[PDB]
Amino acid sequence: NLKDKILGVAKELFIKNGYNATTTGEIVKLSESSKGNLYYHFKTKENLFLEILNIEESKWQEQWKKEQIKAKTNREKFYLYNELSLTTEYYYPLQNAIIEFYTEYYKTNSINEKMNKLENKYIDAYHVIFKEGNLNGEWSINDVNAVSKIAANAVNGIVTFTHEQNINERIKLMNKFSQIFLNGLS
Amino acid sequence: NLKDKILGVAKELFIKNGYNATTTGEIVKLSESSKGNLYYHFKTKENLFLEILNIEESKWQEQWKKEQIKAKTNREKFYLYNELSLTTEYYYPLQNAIIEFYTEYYKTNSINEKMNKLENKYIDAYHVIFKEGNLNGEWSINDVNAVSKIAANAVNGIVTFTHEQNINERIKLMNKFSQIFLNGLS
Ligand SMILES: N=C(N)c1ccc(/N=N\Nc2ccc(C(=N)N)cc2)cc1
């Protein structure tokens, strides 16, 4: 709990003021903890942030798990998951601190390491969809892992580098993509 | 040179660090110049940055012109463009910085105007490729502009969120993408 309290307050601090501006000092006092406790649990702000990202990652899976029920077939799960990724991030408060964190620790392979363990989790989503899709003759892919890293990053790029147009156009495009992509698998 | 020497340093700081990560003070102190210098050419930081992007963009589209000749069909031009994006030292290595600048300056329409004019060069390459492919009868695209934006963004995605993996593993994925994508266009 004192650990959970820290992660909760930290999450809010990062949202209201960003990664860089937020100090462990603030986190320490606001969660009524201590530098020692914070160190014992996370060692560094970087690690603390990675753990928040971890928790967020879990919630996203939990969400997806109950959200994918609206998609009977994997084809649909592909469509839905990509659309969800696009819409939910449009209003994800932590997104900014993440940008800040990423573009701040992508030079050090230290933190860059644990981040892939994290990204892998986001790719599993696809992995499952593509594997499951195979065992249902929805398509036939022999290099799942591959196609999965692709869908993951292709989708993230569409979500990340299309910031300017109205939300409908985006969803329209993202869907066009899921269509094209799922078609090139046949 | 002077102006051109600034652009050179800034370009490095924007990559080696980030948009926000680097300030007008750094660029100056690390160029033997002084504060009250940048004006007629570099009035503001957002101006200096947008300038760098303009450069890198044109240096890349040019390299592509002097390299796409090795691709007889447009099908091959697509693969080729996507592969090179992984190896070039232009534009793409500044995507991280762009992301920040785009999510922290997409309000003042004074930017989104010029900022988006730069987004047309980005998707143009695919525009030409996809459009020409229609004439060359290699495929049948109706919503070229959409596909171009989609391909462009999808690719930037595979390029940006994999910069920490075996450079050849990347080429591999990217090629699998190009394959998957084009096969979907028909
Ligand atoms: N195949 C991967 N390594 C991979 C998989 C999933 C993934 N997901 N998101 N990545 C990601 C990367 C950067 C940002 C950002 N700060 N703009 C946001 C998200 C990123 C990378």
- Report all structural domains of chain A as residue ranges with CATH numbers, in order of start: 1-49 (1.10.10.60), 50-186 (1.10.357.10)
Q: What is each CA distance from A145 to A68, A115, A128, B124, B154, in whole angstroms?
A: 20, 18, 10, 31, 18
Q: How far apart are CA A174 and CA A167, in angstroms?
A: 11
The length of chain A in residues reads 186
Among candidates B161, B28, B26, B44, which has minimal Cα distance to A103? B161
**Whose structure tokens read 């760098």?**
B52
**Whose structure tokens read 């084009």?**
B182
Taking each helix axis as running N to C, give the angle between helix A45-67 and helix A74-90, from 0 to 180 degrees, rounded to the nearest 10.
130
Taking each helix axis as running N to C, give the angle between helix A35-42 and helix A45-67, from 0 to 180 degrees, rounded to the nearest 10.
60
> Cβ atoms within 10 A of the Cβ of B109, count?
8
| Residues sharing a CB contact under 8 Å with residue A80, sequence separation 6 or more, in sequence order | A67, A68, A70, A71
A98 lines ligand 1 (CB under 6 A): yes
> Cβ atoms within 10 A of the Cβ of A21, count?
12
The answer to whether the beta carbons of residues A48 and A42 sit under 8 Å apart is yes
Q: How far apart are CA A46 and CA A44, in angstroms?
A: 5
Which residues in chain B have Cβ-Cβ distances shorter than 8 Å to A106?
96, 163-164
Which residue's CA is the nearest one to ligand 1's atom 6? Answer: A119
What method was applied to determine this entry? X-ray
Tokens found for residue B83: 């592969």
- Compute, in angstroms, the gap from residue A115 CA to the centroid of ligand 1: 9
CA-atom Rg of chain B in angstroms:
18
The answer to whether the beta carbons of residues A129 and A77 sit under 8 Å apart is yes
- What single DSSP character describes residue A21? T
Please give the torsion angle defined by the CA atoms of residues B126, B130, B133 and B135, in that order, rounded to the nearest 10 degrees.
-120
Q: What resolution, expressed in A, was reported for this entry?
A: 2.9
Which residues in chain A have Cβ-Cβ distances shorter than 8 Å to B22?
none
Among candidates A46, A43, A8, A41, which has minimal Cα distance to A27? A8
| Residues sharing a CB contact under 8 Å with residue A59, sequence separation 6 or more, in sequence order | none
**Whose structure tokens read 């462009």?**
B152
**Sign of the Cα pseudo-torsion (B103, B108, B109, B113, in order):** negative
**Whose structure tokens read 């990509």?**
A82
Q: How far apart are CA B120 and CA B90, in angstroms?
A: 16
Q: Where are the alpha helices (DSSP H) in A31-108?
A: 35-42, 45-67, 74-90, 95-105
Which residues in chain A have Cβ-Cβ distances shorter than 8 Å to B18?
103-104
Taking each helix axis as running N to C, give the angle between helix B144-160 and helix A144-160, from 0 to 180 degrees, rounded to the nearest 10.
110
The answer to whether the beta carbons of residues B152 and B177 sit under 8 Å apart is no
A61 lines ligand 1 (CB under 6 A): no
Judged by CB atoms closer than 8 Å, whether chains meet at B164 and A109 is answered as yes
Number of H helices, E strands in chain B: 8, 0
Question: Which atom of ligand 1 sits closest to the CA of residue A103?
Answer: 16
Among candidates B163, B91, B160, which has minimal Cα distance to A160? B160
Q: How far apart are CA B33 and CA B9, in angstroms?
A: 12
Which residues in chain A have Cβ-Cβ distances shorter than 8 Å to B173?
146, 149-150, 153
Tokens found for residue B62: 């040019």
Ligand 1 site-directed mutation target among A122, A127, A147, A158, most atoms within 8 Å of CB: A122
A119 lines ligand 1 (CB under 6 A): yes
Which residue's CA is the nearest one to ligand 1's atom 18? Answer: A99
Question: Which atom of ligand 1 sits closest to the CA of residue A100?
Answer: 16
